[PDB]
Design a protein around this ligand. Structure first.
Ligand SMILES: CN1C(=O)c2ccccc2NC(=O)/C1=C/c1ccccc1
Ligand SMILES: CN1C(=O)c2ccccc2NC(=O)/C1=C/c1ccccc1
Ligand SMILES: [Br-]
Ligand SMILES: [Br-]
Ligand SMILES: [Cl-]
Ligand SMILES: [Cl-]
Ligand code: NI
Ligand code: NI
Lengths: 287, 287
């Protein structure tokens, strides 16, 4: 059976329950085509200048991604559409608050644009977070998901051009001897549609088989504020940060965070006060 | 039987193995009396001006600590002795690399001076991290410790003045029906001695029974770089940060971090480069 498809408008309350059951759901029109167009236009140049993932120039090379893959993260300074429209997505925030209520506050572990070159091979079937957060492998099997991944199509996802594979129900698997491409279904998606998976969903990028098509996606890993992001916004200029909403500032680690503990003592606090109170960080200041 | 006592000089390799077995160890002369004297002198005024833990002025009040308790964190800007001597402690770094090798890089979750007023009541028996990191409760029982706590005496720890209680072996307990003050032994310590416990060691601050003695400690929670610190150094001036060693900068979240994954892709990275490379952060620059 196929990946459940849900409306961002009509089925909002059904999205997280669907992922919790099946380990994957397609959110049709997660981003409007206007937001996709502005996002694509803004990141275009940064994708073109991005070297190979394991470039000898990098002191944090990515040895896992194929040499044809280009990944651009820390999108806040690059993209007005990302910092304003995506970081304040009503649909994203409803799903994340549904997903992470047991733990507390959530933030962006990584927002990245990925462009796959023609003839990009299929990724091995995997769970995310295993190259950055070894801790997640030590969580009890039934522990609520500590991160989820919105794979947003920025170009068409087809069977031919390497649309994502998922194994439905694999987020609940402990024994992995049944892991095979035989067990997968595809995320066929229009630009702005999003495939939502958990950190336990077994999945992979598909094989690009046309030899002509370039596939692009926005991957948003949302995780509990108790886990360290893969990416830093420490070098984002304060003018850009102060142009954001307080919620967007929190998602980029420019605010203190709270756990769901009844008498929570907080994260990234400064002698009982928040980052934002201490540094007198203003919000929604046009540049 | 009593908490094992070890020399910082002679028994360095024995410290972590001792804690892994018994859940607690006393490191005699962890800090020299000179470092304790300079630390005490530097934090003295900040302890005196610190309001009650749950002060109505705070947007992150601590509702757990007794009203008599004063906790001062983000010590880097306050204390030269902390930022230089403590953050670069050869003994601390050997123990942390022994403790956290399975996970990867570690950093400071919180460095805090705590002063307990005369007649401070005993804390309830507890595990640390339960008011900040709900995630830790979902770790498999046998998961390696993701944080440890150095409770460094800055004044004498006596049975009379509320020396820490620990239950030896309690870091391996799953059933907690045997938790009682009957099962505890005391950390009797001279200034500069440290009680080392894990996030699973059942322990409590003791009852101050003299009505005259003020007890002070430096608590250093060291944790894997995959867990978010309780405290932020985001507001520490760049001059102070650039006065530190690269290792000290990493411990305060002013560097990218690495996991122990064979093909680690890193934490707090910026398009495959480190915070320190990106921002051209210099180190060991006198003010
Ligand atoms: C390596 N790797 C990434 O770089 C990555 C990229 C985008 C979003 C999350 C993410 N994290 C991963 O765990 C990851 C998985 C992965 C596995 C197999 C093949 C290629 C990737
Ligand atoms: C509340 N609380 C703290 O504030 C604290 C202080 C120093 C170092 C770590 C730390 N984290 C805790 O988990 C904690 C435990 C705790 C439990 C019972 C009573 C009083 C404290
Ligand atoms: Br993909
Ligand atoms: Br104590
Ligand atoms: Cl790839
Ligand atoms: Cl207390
Ligand atoms: Ni993946
Ligand atoms: Ni404690």
């Amino acid at each position: 059976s196929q990946i459940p498809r849900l409306s961002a408008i009509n089925d909002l309350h059904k999205i997280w329950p669907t992922v919790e059951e099946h380990g994957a759901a397609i959110i049709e029109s997660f981003l409007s085509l206007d937001i996709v167009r502005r996002l694509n236009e803004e990141v275009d140049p940064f994708v073109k200048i991005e070297p190979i993932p394991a470039a000898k120039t990098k002191d944090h090379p990515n040895h896992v991604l194929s040499t044809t893959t280009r990944l651009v993260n820390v999108l806040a300074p690059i993209s007005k559409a990302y910092r304003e429209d995506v970081l304040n997505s009503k649909v994203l925030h409803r799903i994340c608050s549904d997903a992470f209520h047991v733990y507390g506050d959530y933030w962006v572990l990584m927002g990245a644009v990925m462009e796959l070159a023609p003839s990009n091979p299929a990724q091995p079937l995997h769970r995310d977070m295993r190259f950055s957060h070894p801790i997640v492998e030590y969580l009890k099997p039934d522990a609520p998901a500590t991160s989820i991944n919105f794979l947003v199509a920025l170009s068409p996802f087809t069977a031919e051009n390497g649309a994502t594979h998922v194994i439905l129900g694999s987020h609940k698997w402990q024994n992995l001897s049944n892991v095979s491409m035989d067990a997968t279904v595809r995320a066929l998606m229009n630009p702005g549609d999003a495939l939502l998976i958990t950190d336990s969903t077994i999945h992979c990028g598909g094989a690009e088989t046309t030899g002509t098509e370039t596939r692009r996606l926005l991957t948003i890993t949302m995780g509990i504020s108790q886990l360290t992001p893969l990416e830093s916004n420490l070098a984002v200029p304060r003018p850009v940060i102060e142009s954001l909403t307080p919620l967007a500032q929190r998602l980029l680690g420019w605010a203190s965070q709270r756990s769901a503990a009844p008498r929570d003592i907080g994260l990234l606090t400064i002698r009982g006060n928040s980052i934002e109170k201490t540094m007198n960080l203003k919000a929604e200041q046009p540049l």
